[PDB]
Amino acid sequence: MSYNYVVTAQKPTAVNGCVTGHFTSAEDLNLLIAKNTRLEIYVVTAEGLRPVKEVGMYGKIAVMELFRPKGESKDLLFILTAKYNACILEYKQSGESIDIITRAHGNVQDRIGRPSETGIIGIIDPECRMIGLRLYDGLFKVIPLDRDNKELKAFNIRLEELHVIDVKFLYGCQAPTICFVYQDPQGRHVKTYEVSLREKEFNKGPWKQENVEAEASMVIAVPEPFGGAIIIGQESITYHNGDKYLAIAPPIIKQSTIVCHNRVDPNGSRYLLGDMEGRLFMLLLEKEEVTLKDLRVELLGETSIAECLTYLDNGVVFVGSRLGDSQLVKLNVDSNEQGSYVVAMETFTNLGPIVDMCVVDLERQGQGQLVTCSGAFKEGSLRIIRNGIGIHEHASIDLPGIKGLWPLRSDPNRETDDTLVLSFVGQTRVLMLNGEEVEETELMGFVDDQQTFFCGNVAHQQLIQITSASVRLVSQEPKALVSEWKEPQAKNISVASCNSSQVVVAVGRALYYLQIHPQELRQISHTEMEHEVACLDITPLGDSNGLSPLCAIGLWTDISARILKLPSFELLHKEMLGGEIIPRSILMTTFESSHYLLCALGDGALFYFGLNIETGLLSDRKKVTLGTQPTVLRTFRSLSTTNVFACSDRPTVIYSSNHKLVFSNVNLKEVNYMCPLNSDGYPDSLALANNSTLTIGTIDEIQKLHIRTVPLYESPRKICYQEVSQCFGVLSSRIEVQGTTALRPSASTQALSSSVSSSKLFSEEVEVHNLLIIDQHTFEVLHAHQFLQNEYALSLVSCKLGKDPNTYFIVGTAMVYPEEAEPKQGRIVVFQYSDGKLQTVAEKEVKGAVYSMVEFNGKLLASINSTVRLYEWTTEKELRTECNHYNNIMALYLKTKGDFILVGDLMRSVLLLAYKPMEGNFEEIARDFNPNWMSAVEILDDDNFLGAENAFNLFVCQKDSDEERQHLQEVGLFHLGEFVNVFCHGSLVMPTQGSVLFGTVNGMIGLVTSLSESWYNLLLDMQNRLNKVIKSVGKIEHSFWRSFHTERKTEPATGFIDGDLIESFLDISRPKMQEVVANATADDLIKVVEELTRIH
Amino acid sequence: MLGFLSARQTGLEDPLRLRRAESTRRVLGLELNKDRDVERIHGGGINTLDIEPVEGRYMLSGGSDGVIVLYDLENSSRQSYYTCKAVCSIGRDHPDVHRYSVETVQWYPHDTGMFTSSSFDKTLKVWDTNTLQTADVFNFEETVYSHHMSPVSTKHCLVAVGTRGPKVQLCDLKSGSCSHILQGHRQEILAVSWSPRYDYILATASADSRVKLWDVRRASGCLITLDQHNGKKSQAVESANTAHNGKVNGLCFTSDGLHLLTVGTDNRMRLWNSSNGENTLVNYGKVCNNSKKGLKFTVSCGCSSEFVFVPYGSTIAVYTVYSGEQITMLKGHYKTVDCCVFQSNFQELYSGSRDCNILAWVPSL
Amino acid sequence: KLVIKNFRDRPRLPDNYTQDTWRKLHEAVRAVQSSTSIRYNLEELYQAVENLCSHKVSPMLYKQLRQACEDHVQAQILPFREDSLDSVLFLKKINTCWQDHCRQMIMIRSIFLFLDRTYVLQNSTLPSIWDMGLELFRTHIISDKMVQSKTIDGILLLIERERSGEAVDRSLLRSLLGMLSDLQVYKDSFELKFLEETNCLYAAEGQRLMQE
């Protein structure tokens, strides 16, 4: 049995359903958004939205609609998980506490039945007597509500029509009336029935059936004043009421099918409609006193590709999009000079359908940095995901040569820092913060003509300045000197570290520990350290009144960190750091009442030891490499806690989450110095400094994924990083209509250079594929190479083959024609990029589509339609076959580790194809004989082959241990709840062996890792206990939610640990933690789950 | 088909769309395979086949000579071409072998460990898949054309057994009691079938051209008595409501359980509604059959449009259930076909004939 | 990005800072090479290197460092160009002339740590101050044919003694074979000759012992 850990790094960001209504309370105006599993409630304030809750339903939320029964003060909510769990959620706020109480919950799954073609359609009676569901073809499941169902005891009402396109409840009928569009071999026919609970069977409809357009695909139940139902289609919008019939065929909507509708006015005088192309129409109903006069369709403008949109108020329409960004637009009463009444107010970042992604160590750090090809036809774009703590740069300044920053309360009365002290080579400048305006002043008492090693407020309303010549004490008023301690023999001061009441300066080998006293610097003691002092710190700790009894030092010759008790300079402890590199900045600091001595070597490596303040005994010697240049550890406070900022070429923040330090990148090119600048104009800021500029900007909270966005305006398909050329290879695929012309300026049409593939091998709207070359710094498409007419580029891999040194972009294409069903002619082009040019190095016509390709020990391993042939790169520079393999249905996915090949068949689901090099022929080591339709497949270890099928599941094939050894065993089973598009080894952080990121179609970026059996058993026990303790949103048992589910099979989850469920252990109060750990102590398990949380 | 792959990739179409469209494409391209074989072990014809419900791996077959082979359809070899080797077999040397033709072999539902069979020796034996020993045997007073177990019932384990007497027998594989009988038919009962949807709805076809659905919980006759003309030629039920003009010798509920396909010796199929017994007037053209016992046929699962595979003389006919069109006519046999069974997992069809062969049809490309 | 400029910019940072400051290190580099105690103090020298890296004089500072080591290693070849020494004593002579270059060139790295890692590390074309030391030693001392000849013939002649049952300075051998490996000339210069000579001896020993 294998053991694995599945955790969700990025929560899904695709909006598959969004409703509006008074859910939180009567006068509210909520905007619920049904992300795949997340249920992000909102409140529509006068500006933007005010998120109020975000509950993760244990389900794929397939239907969401708000209904208000009789007697309910505020709207309830009905949710239908795609596994067919139905729950009537109700909002209930109790002061701070917000709890989505479940009024009634139940399962409405029929044991046997064809899942309907169009998908689950769940509708509610406008007078709220029943909830009509159409899950399986032929049946129409009705849920009563007049009775108080605490289990939602639905009852099937048989339907005589087997292919129902869309069904809606009509308005203003004494009996609950459905009005659906079904397809029968004579065409499509609207029809109506009168549902009747007492009879549990339909009756004759209020107005008999009628014929509808050949592609009438939607229904809109207009409200009470008009009644009847509108029926949208490809080219017509027919309004029906039984005796009235007003049908129009506007010319604008012919261009693209309409897919989403919504009602603007409560009387339904105006309707919104959005289509696949992204347009946003506006259907207007004209009334007569009432009846309906005529229909008009107006093009409001353009938005994201609208899957589901709602009207909130004042033209604030939320265009929830599965493919693009979930926009939020304003409907101007008048034109915007472009004929568009729509102006995008806000935007919600959405990692759309992740077609494929590659992990790259961009910026040459130790940090993974995903690059996903999210989006679709018009919203295709590259998202660059990277952990970090961003900097909201408020004010940037040009000041080359900065060499130190300190804040100064130049006015003793003022609480906030009104003055910033720069320090340049061989001099010093004082900067005065008077509001956002900042002017340089002169602080009398501070010698301007010397470099400064420290200057800051100290005890007794006094400043201090420690130049390279003399420690100086300045009376804060009227800003004149009161004391100047100097080296007795007149030597330059080499180091200095001050605090509120103590100053220690290390002149060469010798120390001098001054105690600040009112208008008096009293040299308490001194000593002669053996070897030249490198760095030191006396930061106060514990609860001493600014009196630090320790003075950590680091020394030059015998590289070592020590802790000298004060004032006697007694060597409490010594610690040999080792290596040939001296310490450079050593810091003593507290982290959640856990003391540390962070000592940073001059090569970038950083150490942190657990310091015992009383006895000074360094324990838990840990090392972390944060950069290459020498580090400078400066403390700073953020939200009532003290962090540490490690200025280097890779500026890294150190903060302690749950008694475990976290080293987080800061999204900045470089930070030489820093100082917590809490000014009036910039409250709680950081004055980050670099070689050429000085910057200010508040730093963020704990880590979170930061998502750049590079729009392409054309759907990408694949991506590969070619390190040597420093560029990405992206297979865009734009749409053309007619010759042929582009419908919009796409990246492939806006490239610096382009070229059309002139190939002699082979001799509405179409897709004109390309192979973009994206610079990996500017993200500007360097070269856009267009493929042949009617050619689809399905695969792309960057590798160097054979023995030659060149690195090649290799694209496997496949000619497509409408007449055929499976492609016949393809080719494997071998591109080379050089000197801003993309040359065709080779070409190899094949006898099928090239689905997936993977470099195999320098030998290209294509996959033509149902075969996996291992090409060879000949010295003549033309691909030459080596050996084929034909025993497949269709090999779509290939992944390699060493010499083994894992082939993801279309439906046979795996084939551990192994290449025998001594013979030169493939040998099927094993197969799994389940019919698991695959989506993407990946290899973890020698005998752990992860796979993700199309029913939203995961499974782990384990090579077992006669002929039964040829059976791959499924040991892990887990209902992920997303359609996994791509796997790729890696991680986003510099306990869990292995790490496999994977995208989805909803934007989720999970992360699969292996576990030791001991932690597997421990966490499985934890998971069961948490299930017993935590109460889910819909009372959906977690074991059921993760049960490996397919239409033909259903097994409990095993060999997988729900990462999110474990991580929820962090966010449960202490008494319920004690409950969960009723039988090991709570803190130990908090530590364990923290070690798990560290991975993503 | 790359269009479907891209549509699934970008989340446009549900994965269900590609799954069902590809299954329909594969079934439309169905053809005999010389890249696969099933070992010849039956002396006489093959009367029945039943792929196991769960995992679709093993496969029984009731030879007309009383031998119950138990194949294994998984390509355990390494070559593209292979033959489905027969794992076990209830040979004539077996002490408890069936003395005459085995005409129904069915796996015990929800439990592959056991399977059942019945033969003209007036016996129904409950076989243990592992040790191949009769767990229970029920001896009837007359032959047994066909029997069927509920593929949905987790509550009961009754077994409708259509003997050549006029009375349907219900045998209980739990504590033995074949006492429960369903009276109301007039002649032999050539084909019975439980409802895949409802636990207790049993549809029994007879040789007097009547198809009746029985609520076996009810002990006062049948719910429905199917009638060709939907009551147009209304006549009290003493010599009326005949679902065919000759013997009706085959039943197969559609996969959803909403419709009861019937085929009879008058050379017609009829897609009857399963809730009120109203013929839905699907034409199906003229289907040829002349068998004088249970004609087996099955209906596809997991495809866009449900197909039905009916033995048609010496050929398998592929009709579309809800439109009646004739998709094609699989043509590879040398005698009349007695039973075809659909392998839902991979859209493969195994069709035992009277010429001792079991031809495995598979899709092309 | 509210840029701000409301400043008065009077000063000028360096007086004659780069020329004088380098001469401070130049004595320190000279003092370190000759093992004379440093009159100036490392922190002043290190911080001096730091400031010179602010003025972007790292390239010229890198070169002027090279002339310092370039002009000292060459000063060490000439004692070895005198052939009044036998092989065994010579190896300790060159080995010490290598151990000192390691001890010294570590010290010159410690002072110049900032330059080594800020400027040189990014400039992938240039080698670190460490590998800089090996390159100087390799080409200007070990690449000397007479020193290379009398060196490899040194190590080989001890192994032949060791093979014949004598006791040799294993530590001295380890340093030299460490010395050659670090300089990378171990494979080209010494491995071939050693394998060549070893082939001969055991080939001679094999046929010699067979009949005995």
DSSP string over A805-870? ---EEEEEEEE--SS-SS---EEEEEEEEETTEEEEEE--EESS-----EEETTEEE--BTTB--E
Q: Which amino acid makes up residue A70?
A: K
Q: Which of A119, A907, A979 sits opposite B11 (nearest CB)?
A: A979
Name the minimum distance, in Å, from the CA of C61 to any CA of chain A.
Answer: 17
* Residue C9 burial by Cβ neighbours in a 10 Å radius (0-12, 13-18, 19+): exposed
Strands A693-699, A391-398: parallel, antiparallel or unpaired by DSSP? antiparallel
Identity of the residue in A115, A162, A1049 whose CB atom sits nearest the CB atom of B16: A115
Are the beta carbons of A58 and A83 closer than 8 angstroms? no
Q: Is the separation of the CB atoms in C183 and C137 below 8 Å? A: yes
For chain A, the residues whose C-beta falls within 8 A of a C-beta of chain C are 393-398, 401, 403, 424-427, 429, 436-440, 448, 492, 494-495, 508, 532-534, 556, 580-582, 602-604, 628-630, 691
Considering only CB atoms, A353 lies closest to which of B2, B10, B78, namely B10
- Torsion region of C175: left, alpha or beta (phi above 0 gives left; psi -120 to 50 gives alpha): alpha
Asked if A930 and B322 come within 8 Å (Cβ–Cβ), the reply is no
Q: Which of B11, B20, B152 sits opposite A1001 (nearest CB)?
A: B11
Using an 8 Å CB-CB cutoff, list residues of chain C that contact chain A.
Answer: 1-8, 11, 13-15, 17, 41-44, 47, 51, 54-55, 106, 109-110, 113-114, 117-118, 121
What residue type is A967 in one-letter code?
A: H
Any chains having at least 3 CB pairs less than 8 A from chain A are: B, C
Question: Does the distance separating the beta carbons of C2 and A580 come in below 8 Å?
Answer: no
The Cα B224–Cα A97 span in angstroms is 58
Integer Cα distance of B187 and B22 in angstroms: 44
- Chain-chain contact of B2 with A814 (C-beta, under 8 angstroms): yes
Give me the residue from B8, B22, B76 closest to A963, CB to CB. B76
Is A376 an 8 Å CB contact of chain B?
Answer: yes
| Torsion sign, CA atoms A637, A594, A1066, A1007 | positive
Instruction: Report the alpha-carbon distance of residue B304 to residue B174 in Å, rounded.
Output: 38
Q: CA of A232: how far to CAs of A297, A560, A721, in Å? A: 11, 79, 45
- Provide φ and ψ at A1077, rounded to 5°: -115, 35
A372/A393 Cα distance (integer angstroms): 27
Chain A contact set for C128 (CB, 8 A): none
Q: Is A467 helix (H, G, I), strand (E, B) or coil?
A: strand
Token representation of residue B100: 């005459």
Q: What radius of gyration do chain C's Cα atoms show?
A: 24
**Separation of alpha carbons A482 and A516, rounded Å:** 11
Alpha-carbon gap, residue A485 to A363, rounded angstroms: 46
Number of A:C CB contacts under 8 A?
Answer: 83
DSSP A471: E
- Residue A141: phi and psi, rounded to 5, are -75, 120
Q: Give the DSSP letter string of A519-538.
A: TEEEEEEEEE-SS-EEEEE-
Query: Between chains, do A112 and B196 touch, taking CB under 8 Å as contact?
Result: yes
Written as six digits, the tokens of B344 are: 């839902």
Are A424 and C11 inside 8 Å of each other by CB? yes
Residues 267-296 of chain B with CB under 8 A from chain A are 275
How far does A698 lie from chain C, in Å, by closest CA?
Answer: 13
Burial of A826 (0-12, 13-18, 19+ CB in 10 A): buried
Instruction: Give the 3-state secondary structure of residue C115.
Output: helix
On whether any CB of chain B is under 8 Å from the CB of A353, the answer is yes
DSSP 8-state code for residue C38: P
CA-to-CA distance for C197 and C156, rounded, in angstroms?
8
Question: Per-residue DSSP letters for A62-110?
Answer: EEEEEE--TT-SS-EEEEEETT-EEEEEEEEEETTEEEEEEEEEEE---
Q: Which of A112, A849, A866 lies closest to B257 in CB terms? A: A112
DSSP B351: E
Domains of chain B, by residue range, sit at: 1-365
Q: Which of A214, A263, A261, A210 is nearest to A240 (CA)?
A: A210
Question: Across the interface, do C117 and A395 touch by the CB < 8 Å criterion?
Answer: no
Q: Please tell me the distance from the alpha carbon of residue B15 to that of residue B22, in angstroms, as a whole number.
A: 11
- As a whole number of angstroms, the distance between CA B253 and CA B275 comes to 12
Contact: A981, B19; criterion CB under 8 Å: no
Three-state SS at A645: strand
Q: Which helix (H) or strand (E) holds B316?
A: strand B315-320
Q: What is the 3-state secondary structure (H, E, C) of B269-301?
A: EEEEECCCCEECCCCCCCCCCCCCCCCCCEECC
Closest partner residue to A966 among B76, B302, B365, by Cβ?
B76
Cβ contact (<8 Å) for B9 and A981? yes
Which conformational region is residue B99 in: left (phi greater than 0), alpha (psi within -120 to 50 degrees), or beta? alpha
Deposited resolution, Å: 3.5
Which domains are seen in chain A, by residue range?
2-14+351-387+705-1010 (2.130.10.10), 15-350 (2.130.10.10), 388-704 (2.130.10.10), 1011-1096 (1.10.150.910)
Closest C-alpha among A266, A323, A374, A247 to residue A20: A266
B258 shares contact with chain A (CB less than 8 Å)? yes
Residue of C nearest to A697 (CA): C1
- Which of B57, B74, B68, B115 is closest to B90 using CA atoms? B68
Beta pairing partners, A282: A272, A298
Structure tokens given for B251:
């039943």
Name B232's Cβ contacts closer than 8 Å, sequence gap at least 6.
none
Check CB contact of A158 with chain B, cutoff 8 Å: yes
Interface residue of B1, B17, B152, B230 to substitute, partner A, most A CBs within 10 Å:
B1
Whether C32 and C104 have beta carbons less than 8 Å apart is answered as yes
Residue A1049 touches chain B, beta carbons under 8 Å = yes
How many beta carbons lie within 10 A of that of residue A991, not counting itself? 12
Smallest Cα distance from C205 to chain A, Å:
39
Kindly calculate the radius of gyration of chain B based on its CA atoms and give it in whole angstroms: 20
- Selection from A356, A233, A387, A376 nearest residue A797 by Cα: A356
Chain C residue at shortest CA distance from A424: C13
Phi and psi of A169, rounded to 5°?
A: -80, 135
How far from A362 is each of A385, A646, C140, CA to CA, in Å? Answer: 11, 21, 40
Distance between CA atoms of A138 and A117, rounded to whole angstroms? Answer: 11
DSSP one-letter code for B304: S
Here the tokens at position A643 are 């962090």
**Cα–Cα dist A630/A650, whole Å:** 11
The chain B residue lying nearest A119, using CA atoms, is: B14
Beta-sheet strands, E only, within A258-331: 258-263, 270-275, 279-288, 291-302, 308-313, 316-320, 326-331
Find residues 794-813 of chain A whose CB sits inside 8 Å of chain B.
Answer: 794
First-to-last alpha carbon distance for chain C, in angstroms, is 91
> Hey, are the CB atoms on C4 and A436 less than 8 Å from each other?
yes
A847 to chain B, any CB pair closer than 8 A? The answer is no
Measured CA to CA, the distance from residue A813 to residue A792 in angstroms comes to 5
Separation between Cα atoms, residue A799 and residue B294, nearest integer Å? 62
Cβ distance of C17 and A533 shorter than 8 Å: no
> Nearest Cα to A855, choosing from A816, A808, A909, A887?
A808
- Other C-beta atoms lying within 10 Å of the C-beta of residue B79: 10
Per-position DSSP letters for B121-177, written without gaps between them: TTEEEEEETTT--EEEEEE-SS-EEEEEE-SS-SS--EEEEEESSSSEEEEESSS--
Question: What's the token pair of residue A1084?
Answer: 């130990």
For residue B214, what are the CA distances in angstroms to A104, A112, A377, B143, B252? 36, 20, 55, 21, 15
| DSSP 8-state assignment for residue A26 | T
Question: Which contiguous run of DSSP H or E holds residue A1026?
Answer: helix A1013-1029
- Whole-angstrom Cα distance, residue A518 to residue A406? 22
Q: And the tokens for B276?
A: 């009120």
Give the separation between CA A781 and CA A775, rounded to whole angstroms: 6
Task: Tell me which amino acid residue A683 is.
Answer: P
> What's the length of chain B?
365
Contact A360, A371 (CB under 8 A): yes
Question: Tokens standing for B29?
Answer: 């391209």
Alpha helices in chain B (DSSP H): 2-9, 15-28
Q: Which of A161, A794, A883, A887 to mutate to test the interface with B (most CBs of B within 10 A)?
A: A887
Residue B192 to residues A521, B160, B205: CA-CA distances in angstroms?
108, 7, 6
Answer yes or no: are the C-beta atoms of A104 and A151 closer than 8 Å: yes
Taking contacts as CB-CB distances below 8 angstroms, the residues of chain A near B257 are 112-113
Residue A921 contacts residue A868 (beta carbons within 8 Å): no
Is A883 touching B (CB cutoff 8 A)? Answer: no
Q: Are strands B37-38 and B83-84 parallel, antiparallel or unpaired?
A: parallel
The alpha carbon dihedral of A578, A583, A588, A591 has a sign of negative
Contact partners, residue B178, CB within 8 Å, separation at least 6: B138, B140, B161, B169, B170, B171, B172
Number of neighbours of residue A175 by Cβ within 10 angstroms: 15
CA dihedral C158, C161, C167, C169 (to 10 degrees): 0
Beta strands in A960-1031 (DSSP E): 968-974, 983-985, 996-998, 1005-1010
Instruction: Give the residue among B70, B130, B132, B62 at the shortest CA–CA distance from B98.
Output: B62
- Among A342, A297, A336, smallest CA distance to A315 is for A342
Other beta carbons within 10 Å of A866? 19
Residue type, A1046: T
Query: Which other chains touch chain C, taking contact as 3+ CB pairs less than 8 Å apart?
Result: A
Structure obtained using: cryo-EM
Q: Which residues contact residue A914 at a Cβ distance below 8 angstroms, ignoring those fewer than 6 apart?
A: A899, A900, A901, A922, A923, A924, A925
Do B2 and A866 lie within an 8 Å CB cutoff?
no
Task: Tell me the residue ranges of DSSP E strands in A888-963.
Answer: 891-897, 900-905, 912-916, 921-924, 934-941, 944-949, 953-959
Chains A and B touch, contact meaning at least 3 pairs of CB atoms under 8 angstroms apart: yes
CB-CB under 8 Å, B57 with A1048:
no
Closest CB from C5, C13, C41 relative to A494 = C41
Q: Is the dihedral of CA C107, C111, C112, C118 positive or negative?
A: positive
The closest alpha carbon to A860, from A871, A848, A869, belongs to: A871
Closest-CA distance, B11 to chain A, in angstroms, reads: 6
- Looking only at the bridges linking them, the beta strands covering A381-386 and A715-722 are unpaired
Rounded Cα distance, C95 and C109, in Å: 21
**How far is residue B179's CA from residue A531's CA, in Å, rounded to a whole number?**
104
- Which residues are CB-contacts of C36 (< 8 A; sequence separation ≥ 6)? none
Instruction: State phi, psi for C131 to the nearest 5 degrees.
Output: -60, -30
Total Cβ atoms within 10 A of residue A248 = 15
| Cα gap A314→A111, rounded to integer Å | 47
Tokens of B99: 């003395």
- Which residues of chain C make contact with A396, given a CB cutoff of 8 A? 1-4
By CB atoms closer than 10 A (0-12, 13-18, 19+), residue A944 is: buried
* Amino acid making up residue A92: K
**Chain A to chain B, count of Cβ pairs less than 8 Å apart?**
106
User: Which helix (H) or strand (E) covers residue A441, if one does?
Assistant: strand A438-441
Bridge partners of A506, per DSSP, are A495, A511
For A458, counting Cβ atoms within 10 Å of its Cβ (0-12 exposed, 13-18 middle, 19+ buried), the class is: buried
Q: What does each C-alpha distance from B227 to A990, B202, B207, B249 come to in angstroms?
A: 75, 17, 15, 16
**Residue A135 to residue B255: CA distance in whole angstroms:** 16
